[PDB]
């Protein structure tokens, strides 16, 4: 009586149940694991807070309306302030982590709409100015708020044009990245497990984000007659196999 459909994920002191899942994606078919010695470089023993950092943090909720263009969060940024995960983050020189991402959106059998939930490794954004204008730090570190693709261009911020993925590629091809759809008629959640993907064994958690999670409405939300025209979307994310190394004074970052 197991269905692909019902699932439970327990991680730390927190549990999620979905009764309307559509399997789960594990990026590149690899599950998060700690850093092996053969791959290690820094000689420091690392710190593995385990259950105090590897639990589920639910970010603040978004509201899908008929005019929504899509939202974008960066990792580990989105979690920069969650509990002890965040403290560890500002206090060590280097850290590394994988995540379980669970995006939630329920409706009824009269609604229609379909969101794309995708994880993009190394999502370098484009400046809407063109040329070689850079995208300032603050703009690519929105924190739990994430970036709202239907917000206005700002100065020093990225471009927010959806048919171009914020980088000069077409929305249609985002499907080459680990992703899952939430089609109100099928699905009510999306779950993706992200292994740590980098060109170095461990890195800085503040100067470099290693994935952007993106939720994009593709088939517009259509509510039943005289229904309220909107649904909330909630994102809950859990660091998994986290390791921190090179402890010290506590980083100070712009803004």
């Amino acid at each position: 009586g197991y269905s692909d459909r019902v699932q439970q994920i327990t991680l730390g002191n927190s549990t999620i149940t979905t009764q309307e899942a559509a399997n789960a994606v594990v990026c590149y078919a690899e599950w998060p694991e700690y850093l092996p010695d053969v791959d290690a470089s820094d000689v420091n023993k690392t710190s593995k807070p385990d259950t105090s950092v590897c639990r589920f943090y639910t970010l603040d909720s978004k509201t899908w309306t008929t005019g929504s263009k899509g939202w974008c969060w960066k990792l580990p940024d989105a979690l920069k302030d969650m509990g002890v995960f965040g403290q560890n983050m500002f206090f060590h020189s280097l850290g590394r982590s994988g995540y379980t991402v669970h995006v939630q959106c329920n409706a009824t059998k009269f609604h229609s709409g379909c969101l794309l939930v995708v994880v993009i490794p190394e999502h370098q954004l484009a400046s809407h100015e063109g040329g070689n204008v850079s995208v300032k730090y603050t703009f690519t570190h929105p924190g739990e708020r994430g970036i709202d693709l239907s917000s206005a261009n700002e100065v020093g911020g990225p471009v927010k044009d959806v048919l171009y993925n914020m980088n000069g590629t077409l929305l249609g091809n985002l499907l080459i990245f680990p992703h899952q759809f939430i089609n109100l008629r099928t699905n009510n959640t999306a779950t993706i497990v992200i292994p740590y993907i980098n060109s170095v064994p461990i890195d800085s958690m503040t100067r470099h984000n290693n994935v952007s999670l993106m939720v994009i409405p593709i088939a517009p939300l259509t509510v039943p007659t005289g229904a309220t025209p909107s649904l909330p979307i909630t994102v809950t994310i859990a660091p998994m196999c986290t390791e921190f190394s090179g402890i010290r004074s506590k980083s100070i970052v712009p803004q």
């Binding site: 490794p121 190394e122 980088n167 000069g168 080459i176 099928t186 970052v253």
Partner: protein, 273 residues
């Protein structure tokens, strides 16, 4: 190898063509799941689509130019093209760039070919024979100030001398600092509020300096350098969506404003053929 097996009528409870794309999978459906097929063999291996093959041919990565002329009274050799210099990079020209950016991280050895041809746009009695000297000036090492500085001694820095009209060829191991080169980097060099964003900060490869060894003749000679790059021993990770809009800058993803629609509009209906 069979490309298609033989398959006949079906009346089952087992439907391989109904799936749920919401899952993120592309189910491996074949012609024989939905029509009646006959056996056929592949006769093919997919040899020429190997990434080593795809990135393994020489591509032009840079065209520069230097001239041989009397430096007498020149206050700025660099500025007179008495010796130009190039900031080694692999994205200044776009044919090869779009190919590499199909991947996120890439690792390979490089084979460089350098073709140098001379031009004599204004009245010369003859064509002189010039020897070019291209130096590798990695970051931290004195960079040439005049076309005949102590720098050109290049006692510790690899340099090649070849003749204009000829070609020079040598191969450099993968010089990246990390395990792969980042084709993309969503980071900064530090948490500064105004530091540049992108990879510009990461592919700190240094530059390469060219000059003519010959002193000047009576006429002036323009030498134009073309650098070709071939990846050998390629390794590529994490495929990405291909580049759709035009490029504007080395190292940023930025596209131009008021660009044009990249998807061709139908001449007719959705229903049109």
């Amino acid at each position: 190898t069979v490309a298609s097996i033989s398959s006949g009528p079906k009346h089952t409870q087992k439907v391989p063509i109904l799936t749920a794309n919401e899952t993120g999978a592309t189910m491996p459906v074949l012609p024989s799941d939905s029509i009646e097929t006959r056996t056929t063999y592949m006769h093919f291996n997919g040899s020429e689509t190997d990434v080593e093959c795809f990135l393994g041919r020489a591509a032009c990565v840079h065209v520069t130019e230097i001239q041989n002329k009397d430096a007498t009274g020149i206050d700025n050799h660099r500025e007179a093209k008495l010796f130009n210099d190039w900031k080694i990079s692999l994205s200044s020209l776009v044919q090869l760039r779009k190919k590499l950016e199909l991947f996120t991280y890439v690792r390979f050895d490089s084979e460089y070919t350098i073709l140098a041809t001379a031009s004599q746009p204004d009245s010369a009695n003859y064509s002189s024979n010039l020897v070019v000297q291209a130096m590798y000036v990695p970051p931290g090492a004195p960079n040439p100030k005049e076309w005949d500085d102590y720098t050109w001694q290049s006692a510790s820095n690899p340099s090649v001398f070849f003749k204009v009209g000829d070609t020079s060829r040598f191969s450099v191991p993968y010089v990246g600092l990390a395990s792969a080169y980042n084709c993309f980097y969503d980071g900064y060099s530090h948490d500064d509020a105004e530091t540049q964003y992108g990879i510009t900060v990461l592919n700190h490869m240094g530059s390469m300096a060219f000059r003519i060894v010959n002193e000047h003749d009576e006429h002036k000679t323009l030498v134009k350098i073309r650098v070709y790059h071939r990846a050998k021993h390629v390794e590529a990770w994490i495929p990405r969506a291909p580049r759709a809009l035009p490029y504007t800058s080395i190292g940023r993803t930025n596209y131009p404003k008021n660009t044009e629609p990249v998807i061709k509009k139908r001449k007719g209906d959705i229903k049109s053929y």
